[PDB]
Design a protein around this nucleic acid. Structure first.
Ligand SMILES: Nc1nc2c(ncn2[C@H]2C[C@H](O)[C@@H](COP(=O)(O)OP(=O)(O)OP(=O)(O)O)O2)c(=S)[nH]1
Ligand SMILES: [Ca+2]
Ligand SMILES: [Ca+2]
Ligand SMILES: [Cl-]
Ligand code: NA
Ligand code: NA
Length: 325
DNA sequence: CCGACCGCGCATCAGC
DNA sequence: GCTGATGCGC
DNA sequence: GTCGG
């Protein structure tokens, strides 16, 4: 938290561009700069000191100057005062409400937590569950609880078929002491890039996790991506655990290493890596790394480890715990 | 400069 | 019903 | 908003 004052500022600005301005590249620009200043291992004394880092330019320089003097950012102070944009940025904290839906509701006078509860009929399914567990989802999960959840999901995946492999990823695999939510990579030998020797593969796992009341709600579901809700079992008289966001990704087993790369993140690490891949003439997604021959994807290169992906784009390997950009 | 700015799964809707 | 585009999220 | 041809 060396320059916590500054990354916070830039994150709030990032949210405002993402949510009220619907300016996604400004949101990325602001987030990259917050990321690179967070990695910086000195207390920043100057806006010019910051401009030296990639992703800090003039406009962020001047804002860091204003903030270091006054402790504030006038732009942020007035953004806070504005009743409209403050409401739109609140509504996007509900899972399923993004920047268009948040602005559509505040056009209809729906702008506070009491108003969403009154008009749940105007909300789709993902937004209803988002509203139901709004408080729970704001809470972070302790690594202790993440370890309990891991044991339930892996023991249940083993009871459906012992050939499943389930790998917990996200900030957990990077060694976070606390997690936003849980992310499970799933392979089965019957699902590769060649064929899908068995159907319902992801369905079976979700069904069983629902049969034991671990999974409690479904935001979205398909053949390879599940997005929903889960809860640890509690003991007698114990207050129930908070409900938790769970994501499960069924990845073809021969593409495990590219998938576990994707799912370990961070999101910003993923972005710097794929962006650097393009500079080296490659493209990386969760499935493959492919050459660029006129900027059209050639054939998947062969991949036996995570490090093989790092070697193609000519990066030294970085442990999961060092990808938390 | 001043256009380019990762990559993709699922849900929803307009058009056909 | 499909297809593309848009919204939402990872 | 930043930045690289
Ligand atoms: N390429 C890419 N990958 C992403 C993105 N967002 C998330 N991911 C990937 C990497 C993330 O580690 C993984 C899980 O996303 P998640 O929102 O849970 O983030 P996380 O790193 O686990 O952080 P917390 O869950 O602990 O808040 O999905 C974006 S925007 N792009
Ligand atoms: Ca997570
Ligand atoms: Ca997640
Ligand atoms: Cl691919
Ligand atoms: Na810079
Ligand atoms: Na949101």
């Amino acid at each position: 938290t060396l320059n916590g004052g500054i990354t916070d500022m830039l994150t709030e600005l990032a949210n405002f561009e993402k949510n009220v301005s619907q300016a996604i590249h400004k949101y990325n620009a602001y987030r990259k700069a917050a990321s690179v200043i967070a990695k910086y291992p000195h207390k920043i004394k100057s806006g010019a000191e910051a401009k030296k880092l990639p992703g800090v330019g003039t406009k962020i320089a001047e804002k860091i100057d204003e903030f270091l003097a006054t402790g504030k950012l006038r732009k942020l102070e007035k953004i806070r005062q504005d009743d409209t944009s403050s409401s739109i940025n609140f509504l996007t904290r509900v899972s399923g409400i993004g920047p268009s839906a948040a602005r559509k509701f505040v056009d209809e006078g729906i702008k506070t937590l009491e108003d969403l509860r009154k008009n749940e009929d105007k909300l789709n399914h993902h937004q209803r569950i988002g509203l139901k567990y709004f408080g729970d989802f704001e809470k972070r999960i302790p690594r202790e609880e993440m370890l309990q959840m891991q044991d339930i999901v892996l023991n249940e995946v083993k009871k459906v078929d012992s050939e499943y492999i389930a790998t917990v990823c996200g900030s957990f695999r990077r060694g976070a002491e606390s997690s936003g939510d849980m992310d499970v990579l799933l392979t089965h030998p019957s699902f590769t890039s060649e064929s899908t020797k068995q159907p319902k593969l992801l369905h079976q796992v979700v069904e069983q996790l629902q049969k034991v009341h671990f999974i409690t709600d479904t935001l979205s579901k398909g053949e390879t991506k599940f997005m929903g809700v889960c809860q640890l079992p509690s003991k007698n008289d114990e207050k129930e655990y908070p409900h938790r966001r769970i994501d499960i990704r069924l990845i073809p087993k021969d593409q495990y290493y590219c998938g576990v790369l994707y799912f370990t993140g961070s999101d910003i690490f993923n972005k710097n890596m794929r962006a650097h891949a393009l500079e080296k003439g490659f493209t990386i997604n969760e499935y493959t790394i492919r050459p660029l021959g006129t900027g059209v994807a050639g054939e998947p290169l062969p991949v036996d480890s995570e490090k093989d992906i790092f070697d193609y784009i000519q990066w030294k390997y970085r442990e999961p715990k060092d990808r938390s950009e």
